[PDB]
Amino acid sequence: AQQAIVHNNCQDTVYVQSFPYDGSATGPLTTLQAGQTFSEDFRKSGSTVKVSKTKTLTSPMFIGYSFSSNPDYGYYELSSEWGNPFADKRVTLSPGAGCQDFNCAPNDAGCYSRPDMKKVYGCPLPINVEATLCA
Amino acid sequence: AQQAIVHNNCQDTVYVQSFPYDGSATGPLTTLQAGQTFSEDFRKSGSTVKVSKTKTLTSPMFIGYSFSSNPDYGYYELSSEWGNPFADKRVTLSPGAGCQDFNCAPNDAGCYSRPDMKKVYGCPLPINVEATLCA
């Protein structure tokens, strides 16, 4: 199966949880200590994978993956709309070769998808979507 | 309500035609004199809009669009994968404010979506997908 993956390279522990775009029940609340990795098989409806520094999911960054009419593409989004605990760190999000990455340098807020500057990238299926926190 | 639009600001007559993703009939083969504009209502299934300097649509540029719900995004691609008659001129493709656009300078070949580097963007609905040739 296609994978949504979040690598925690931060010193700090993070919490990751995937909220399907169809609005159904989420995946398990996942604790990632330094060096640990979250992964899940792609949810059929797409999902927003929230990443927070608290168990209560305060002000999470999210990694979104979704699909469209055009059956050829998957779409991914690295968003600071609701917050970003890693704003002073590097965060990368990649669908693999042949498509655009997010490679967001420390303190480069304008690299992320923003409420009034949305950044959602498309890429031919199949894809894995792989992020590193504190790259 | 949403429209896919092609403004021909070039000195040349151009030809535009839409090819629905769901296989329904092609749109009218549209001749745009220098200065004229093509437009169509958003097709539910999405579409490929070919843009060429010949009526036979040989080696055309294309504008691709589609849209989804949950998330409610519209997707748009400015592609030179099949050719680009307007490579020596400026071409823009914008969904309106608040989202990543294409603004492809004259002879900036890498600005377009390419076979080995796809460039497809998403934006919250509703949008008009609006291209200007020789901007």
Residue numbers in the entry:
A (entry chain B), B (entry chain A): 18 to 152
Paper passage:
Magnaporthe oryzae, a fungal pathogen of rice blast, is the most devastating rice pathogen and causes a destructive decrease in rice production in epidemic years. MoHrip2, a novel elicitor isolated from M. oryzae, is an exocrine protein. In our previous work, we showed that MoHrip2 causes necrotic lesions and triggers early signaling events in the tobacco leaf defense system, and we showed that MoHrip2 also enhanced resistance to M. oryzae in rice. Although, the MoHrip2 amino acid sequence showed up to 70% similarity to several specific plant fungal pathogen proteins, the specific function of both MoHrip2 and proteins with similar sequences are unknown.
In this study, we solved the crystal structure of MoHrip2 by X-ray crystallography using the single-wavelength anomalous dispersion (SAD) method. There were two identical protein molecules in an asymmetric unit, and only one monomer is shown. The overall architecture is a β-barrel consisting of 11 β-sheets and a very short α-helix. The short helix was located between the β9 and β10 sheet. MoHrip2 contains six cysteines that are involved in three intramolecular disulfide bridges, which occur between cysteines 27 and 151, 116 and 140, and 121 and 129. On the basis of the crystal structure, MoHrip2 showed a high similarity to the three-dimensional structure of a large family of proteins containing a thaumatin-like domain despite the low homology of their primary sequences. Of these proteins, we were interested in xylanase inhibitor TL-XI, to which MoHrip2 was most similar in three-dimensional structure. The 14 amino acid residues located in the middle region form the functional region responsible for the HR and the disease-resistance induction of the MoHrip2 elicitor. These 14 residues include a β-strand within a β-barrel and part of two neighboring loops. During the process of HR induction when interacting with its target, MoHrip2 might undergo local conformational changes around this stretch, especially in the loop regions, to expose active residues necessary for function.
